[PDB]
Amino acid sequence: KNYSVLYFQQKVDHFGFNTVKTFNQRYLVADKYWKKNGGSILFYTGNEGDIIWFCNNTGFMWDVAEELKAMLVFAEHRYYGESLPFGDNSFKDSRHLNFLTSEQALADFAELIKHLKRTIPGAENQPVIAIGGSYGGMLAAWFRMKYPHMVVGALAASAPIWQFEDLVPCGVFMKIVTTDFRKSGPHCSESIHRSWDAINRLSNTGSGLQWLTGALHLCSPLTSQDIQHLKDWISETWVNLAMVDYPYASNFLQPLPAWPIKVVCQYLKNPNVSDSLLLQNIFQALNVYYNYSGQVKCLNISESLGTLGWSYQACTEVVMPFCTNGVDDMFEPHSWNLKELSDDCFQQWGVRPRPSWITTMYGGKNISSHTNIVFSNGELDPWSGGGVTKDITDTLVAVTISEGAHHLDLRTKNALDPMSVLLARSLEVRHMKNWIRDFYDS
Amino acid sequence: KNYSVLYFQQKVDHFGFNTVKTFNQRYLVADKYWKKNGGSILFYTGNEGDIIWFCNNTGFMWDVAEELKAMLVFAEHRYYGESLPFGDNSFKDSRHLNFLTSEQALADFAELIKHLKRTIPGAENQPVIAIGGSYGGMLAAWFRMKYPHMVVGALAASAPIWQFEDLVPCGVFMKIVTTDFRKSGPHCSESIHRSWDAINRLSNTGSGLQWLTGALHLCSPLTSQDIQHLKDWISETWVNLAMVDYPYASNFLQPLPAWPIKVVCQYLKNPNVSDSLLLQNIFQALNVYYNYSGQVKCLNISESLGTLGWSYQACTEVVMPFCTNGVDDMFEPHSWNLKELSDDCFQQWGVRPRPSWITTMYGGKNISSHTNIVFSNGELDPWSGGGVTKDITDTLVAVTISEGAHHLDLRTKNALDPMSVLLARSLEVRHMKNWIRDFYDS
Ligand SMILES: *[C@@H]1O[C@H](CO)[C@@H](O[C@@H]2O[C@H](CO)[C@@H](O)[C@H](O)[C@H]2NC(C)=O)[C@H](O)[C@H]1NC(C)=O
Ligand SMILES: *[C@@H]1O[C@H](CO)[C@@H](O[C@@H]2O[C@H](CO)[C@@H](O)[C@H](O)[C@H]2NC(C)=O)[C@H](O)[C@H]1NC(C)=O
Ligand SMILES: *[C@@H]1O[C@H](CO)[C@@H](O)[C@H](O)[C@H]1NC(C)=O
Ligand SMILES: *[C@@H]1O[C@H](CO)[C@@H](O)[C@H](O)[C@H]1NC(C)=O
Ligand SMILES: *[C@@H]1O[C@H](CO)[C@@H](O)[C@H](O)[C@H]1NC(C)=O
Ligand SMILES: *[C@@H]1O[C@H](CO)[C@@H](O)[C@H](O)[C@H]1NC(C)=O
Ligand SMILES: *[C@@H]1O[C@H](CO)[C@@H](O)[C@H](O)[C@H]1NC(C)=O
Ligand SMILES: *[C@@H]1O[C@H](CO)[C@@H](O)[C@H](O)[C@H]1NC(C)=O
Ligand SMILES: *[C@@H]1O[C@H](CO)[C@@H](O)[C@H](O)[C@H]1NC(C)=O
Ligand SMILES: *[C@@H]1O[C@H](CO)[C@@H](O)[C@H](O)[C@H]1NC(C)=O
């Protein structure tokens, strides 16, 4: 429904006394259904984008507001949306971006909760539950781990809190992406697997380069220096699809039908095919993701401040090891190269990744002492490879959604939602209301 | 006995990527009694001074090493001893002192534990227990709260983790100091209480100012501009004595006998006294603290890098509210003035205190979710006013030492140790071995 757009003055640096500069962090408040009379606060720990986007898309929060008689708070992450510490200069240099860390964001969330309990009459002694998806989920989980005095519990939806170092294998994500295509149709993964070598052949002559350009209906003519970028963009497509493999039609990044992988896997399916015919089928598949509603005239393989911030973060703290092997996946082999990644990070930002940091700060797998965190994960979501899929304790629990892609549980109810989601969404509220009840009884 | 002096390269900034500068943090290792064969690591979270000083004085650690078959680690706090990030320049400006926070110190401790488990063969899968006294105690407790993946538990000895904001009354510390003198002899507190007004009278004339100088055997002649400093120094004496009111003779800051308050309270005791005679008795009392072994010719009321660092910290994060009222204490009234304190901090360092910070970071009183922390406190220790004196849970436990001044429990055994200490020191090991056992059985 409707909310109020609010601003709160925040220190730029919570970890140092030298800078005294402030900035306004944007946040949203939805108060209908909230009962001052023994209710609760559902706090979304904002991630890598505009807070309105997360507000507009986390349906489960609005869907569960009345039942939990809650106030909804959506807190924007510093350096995203309108919550820029140095305004336009925020991405200027390594000096200006120094304050973009997960610790600074968690510290903003504590200051903001402090402010709401102080400001809103009735809030002062109410329980607050942290909710988040993807990095927002990692943030929500870490917020209960470090600030248990601020939040009673956390719902960490598709939060890959273990996608680091040697915790999980670098192959897993792409292995799951492959599994999605294989289980979505006969000879689908096999078709994609064979496609790379076929693109490589055609990349050899200028005539083949011209043919490829037309077959794929590209905007610009392919040169031989473009071939690695072309394959990267196609790989990026299959990846995207695995995260958006929803039980119903959707318009998140692109207009897409129900079970989009099943729809693309229809164009592949025939094994007895020529390399020329195989790439025509590949196009048809690309066409469903990029042009499902006649949206484009040609496919442009080339492709902002939200990606800039994420890039900085991926270059500093959030260093997730990724690789493909062509054996456990349908992709060409690519190893995880920390050294190479480090040098590109220094070139763009003038900073170097700390690949062990997150593990030293947030604990890695060693988190048994914590309580009240429900980790939900979809079976289709490649991100589940780096998440928690089995219960750590009676209070640190895992919830799997078979037929669930990237955090389906946080979406607005559809009709097409399998039992696995509704059943999980209910287990979520079950746990949330057990945290509120336990808080009020102490 | 004997230890090894070691150094470990540490990042200057753990909370930012802009600075890449490093420094060597000093640490000590005692390995006799340590069994690679299912033992433990007793880690002292270094506080506001030289690590050797803490090593030389935390007897309980060496006394319990064999029983817990442990390696002793003494980690120096950044900006103290030889662990200076910018060497001689470390205290230069507000820019250079930016990195002196409790979070940075806790982050150094995590990096150092990581290094020992990586470096020392056998350490890798052993349990580590954080030990600390005073601020070291606050640090040890906070280290289990934030890094439970690094330490199994903590022994927080005389750690005033609640000496902030409105958590406790600003009067408490000085109320306890008063109680120590009152219970240590008839008319002792009454004598000190009356002394202030008597010093004020004599401060009026130059003849009285001269008399006072001789009666107190001062080094420099008292002027009227010195009177507030004189009273401050005498107040500082009674304070010191309450923290060092030990059951046996000691030479920590000054050569002192057993129960030094009882010894000073002998010189007061007579109520039926003149103001002139009262100040002669006050001197006799000052004489036991400053000259018990003929150490000085005169008492110098005027009085370093360890105080500088502590001053910075007390000006930034560790902002503990203090006051005297003359009703619940034996002192002249002085209110807690945050505004005044803030301006003096800006004048000396160019920084302003954040009086609510520690509470937002470490949780204040709201710490029930944490586990395995034993808070010991002495009954005489004025610092116990801001500490934990009753059990929060079965695992967050309080231990009181009647006849115990400032962290008596951490000292080397004497013979003169009351049952209350030995009984508490044993309950400490009881809990410590329950954390090691539980770790090994999982
Ligand atoms: C995107 O989808 C639409 C419709 O499927 C395509 O638009 C067609 O354009 C062709 C040639 O330019 C015309 O003959 C027709 O007007 C369109 N067909 C239909 C059925 O509407 C468009 O070319 C698609 N594919 C790509 C790669 O852009
Ligand atoms: C500190 O203690 C000693 C001993 O109690 C004092 O030294 C005395 O000095 C006086 C005068 O200067 C001499 O007559 C004697 O040599 C000392 N007496 C004894 C018993 O040794 C000293 O003055 C004390 N008090 C102060 C305030 O300094
Ligand atoms: C949010 O959705 C509303 C309508 O539901 C729309 O006006 C707006 O464009 C959306 N904003 C974002 C950032 O998605
Ligand atoms: C591929 O070819 C062979 C024989 O020509 C056949 O046995 C098999 O069923 C074929 N499959 C498809 C999907 O065409
Ligand atoms: C492709 O997309 C980018 C990104 O906005 C744009 O700047 C570029 O000019 C585009 N070219 C074509 C032919 O679509
Ligand atoms: C942390 O967990 C891991 C694997 O989950 C285990 O092997 C390890 O030894 C645990 N704890 C410590 C303190 O080393
Ligand atoms: C530590 O004690 C030893 C002897 O036990 C001594 O040589 C040294 O002066 C002491 N150092 C400190 C800093 O107290
Ligand atoms: C103080 O004086 C009175 C009478 O002169 C007496 O009752 C009381 O015991 C005295 N106490 C001391 C310690 O001199
Ligand atoms: C008093 O102590 C200080 C601190 O070291 C010193 O600088 C000063 O000159 C001293 N004066 C006397 C008379 O003791
Ligand atoms: C924190 O503890 C205090 C006093 O110890 C209590 O009144 C308070 O409401 C507690 N928790 C919250 C979340 O407000």
Numbering used by the authors:
A (entry chain B), B (entry chain B): 46 to 348, 353 to 491
What does the article say, verbatim?
PRCP is a lysosomal, serine carboxypeptidase that cleaves hydrophobic C-terminal amino acids adjacent to proline. The S28 family of peptidases consists of two enzymes, PRCP and DPP7. PRCP contains an α/β hydrolase domain harboring the catalytic Asp-His-Ser triad and a novel helical structural domain that caps the active site. PRCP was originally discovered as an angiotensinase and has since been implicated in vasodilatory, proinflammatory, and metabolic pathways.
The crystal structure of human PRCP was determined using MIRAS phasing techniques at 2.8 Å resolution by analyzing native, mercury and platinum-derivatized crystals. Interpretation of heavy-atom positions and resultant electron-density maps show that the asymmetric unit contains one molecule of PRCP with an unusually high solvent content of 82%. The final refined model consists of residues 46-348 and 353-491, five N-linked glycans, and four disulfide bridges (residues 215-372, 233-310, 264-343 and 364-394). Clear evidence of covalently attached and ordered saccharide is observed at the other five canonical glycosylation sites. The overall architecture of PRCP consists of two main structural entities: an α/β hydrolase domain and a novel SKS domain. The first part of the insertion (residues 194-334) consists of five helices packed into a novel helical bundle (the SKS domain) that caps the active site. The catalytic triad consisting of Ser 179, Asp 430 and His 455 can be identified based on structural similarity with other hydrolases. An unanticipated feature of the PRCP active site is an apparent charge-relay system that links the catalytic histidine (His 455) with His 456 and Arg 460. Structural alignments strongly suggest that the hydrophobic pocket in PRCP, formed by Trp 432, Trp 459, Met 183 and Met 369 is functionally equivalent to the S1 binding sites of PEP and DPP4. The binding of known substrates by PRCP that are cleaved at the C-terminus requires access to the long substrate binding groove of PRCP.
